Amino acid sequence: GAMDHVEFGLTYSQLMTLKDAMLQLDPNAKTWMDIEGRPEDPVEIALYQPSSGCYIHFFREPTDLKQFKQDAKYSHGIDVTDLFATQPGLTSAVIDALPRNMVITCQGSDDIRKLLESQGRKDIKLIDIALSKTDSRKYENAVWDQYKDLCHMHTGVVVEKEEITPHCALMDCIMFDAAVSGGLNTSVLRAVLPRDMVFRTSPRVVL
RNA sequence: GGGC
RNA sequence: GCCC
Ligand SMILES: [Mn+2]
Ligand SMILES: [Zn+2]
């Protein structure tokens, strides 16, 4: 509101922990980014650097719940109850912490661009691989086969009617990279963010 | 064609 | 279904 003036969603302590964690990102390595949800109301964010296997992956509660339940049916299949424990402030904090003039690669750059610009990061350069749906998802099964344990949010049925595999920001990054590289490596990935930064963890008794 |  |  007009009388509310809060600069950050995170405490300085957590902002400093975030800054340190993001030193694991190489400012010059190929970096994929993808989101689920609208750029004005994102619910899942992923960045991925195949060179190290490092990824950033986190969630956000939707503001437009009617649009969300609709988007879930046709794209992401994310159960909204599973988004309760998420850290507010993380989307802005992570985007603000990205290196100046970083080059980010994506599939369909329009939504990624709107998100970054809404966060004042017009300095970030975007490379759109601009593949067909078919070509971009050649390694879709192979990626889910290998990395399913990295995201459990996508349990809703998604339709195109015909049922299709749900869209995950993290699996998307991995499979798009596989498509461009012409193959998928078998390698163990590494989460950049601490678990307690991404979700509300931690009571012995109610009240 | 894309994106959710 | 909605968005470019
Ligand atoms: Mn996308
Ligand atoms: Zn996911």
Closest to A45 measured CA to CA, from A4, A2, A86: A86
Residue A45 and residue A56 in contact, taking contact as beta carbons nearer than 8 Å = yes
Q: Which domains does chain A have, with CATH numbers?
A: 1-201 (3.30.420.410)
Ligand nearest to the CA of A42: 1
Closest to A154 measured CA to CA, from A132, A143, A170: A170
Distance from residue A97's CA to the centre of ligand 2 (Å): 22
Tell me the β-bridge partners of A44. Answer: A36, A59
User: Given in angstroms, what resolution was this structure solved at?
Assistant: 1.7
B chain positions with any atom within 7 Å of a protein CB: 1-4
Residue A176 and residue A32 in contact, taking contact as beta carbons nearer than 8 Å = yes
Distance from residue A108's CA to the centre of ligand 1 (Å): 6
